């Protein structure tokens, strides 16, 4: 089990990932299940389908429901405070 | 992080629904339902959310879902003894 900090530059107008999961559901932490061609995640190259997102900009997603985890990721992508998102991901 | 759990064959069925296997969203079989009355329910140490890594020492890592299910079913069908051993993990 390896945790990797992946910096995704906001290179495109969209993030372009589909996430599945959150607390109290079958997949307990958000897992990347789709990466859309052309989006910021696809340009990164270090994000992969199957990666489980543990943290977003240092904010843990452990124990968060899906709606809240998606809100945190969407806010991190939208904010003009920085031109990137740090994801801490794992691949077990 | 990984725990050995011995499930006694206290009922005619194992009584679990599993989801997962290689090359799918959930890469290893995860227990998503435990049926009331089955062997898993009587165990008390198996939980929904547990991911099965091994069955009687046989790794499930890298196996596709149908093969992982076949291995578990075959292990449960044993007549030589009255239990099955799972190596499980939770996260």
């Amino acid at each position: 089990p390896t945790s990797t900090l992946v910096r995704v530059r906001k290179s495109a107008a969209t993030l372009g990932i589909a996430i599945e999961g959150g607390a109290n559901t079958r997949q307990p932490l958000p897992r990347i299940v789709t990466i859309q061609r052309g989006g910021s995640a696809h340009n990164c190259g270090q994000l992969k389908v199957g990666h489980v997102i543990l943290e977003v900009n240092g904010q843990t997603l452990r124990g968060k429901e899906h709606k809240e985890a998606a809100r945190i990721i969407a806010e991190a992508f939208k904010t003009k405070e920085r031109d990137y998102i740090d994801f801490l991901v794992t691949e077990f | 992080t990984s725990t050995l759990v011995r499930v006694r064959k206290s009922a005619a069925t194992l009584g679990i629904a599993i989801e997962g296997g290689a090359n799918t969203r959930q890469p290893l079989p995860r227990i998503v339902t435990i049926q009331r009355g089955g062997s898993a329910h009587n165990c008390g140490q198996l939980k929904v959310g547990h991911v099965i890594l091994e069955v009687n020492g046989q790794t499930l890592r890298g196996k596709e879902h149908k093969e992982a299910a076949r291995i578990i079913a075959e292990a449960f069908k044993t007549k030589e003894r009255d239990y099955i051993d799972f190596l499980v993990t939770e996260f």
């Binding site: 199957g50 | 069925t13 629904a17 969203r25 879902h65 578990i72 079913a73």
Partner: peptide, 13 residues
Amino acid sequence: ERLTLPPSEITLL
């Protein structure tokens, strides 16, 4: 590279 993972299969045991 693989850009999607399909829903997992399910079995009742």
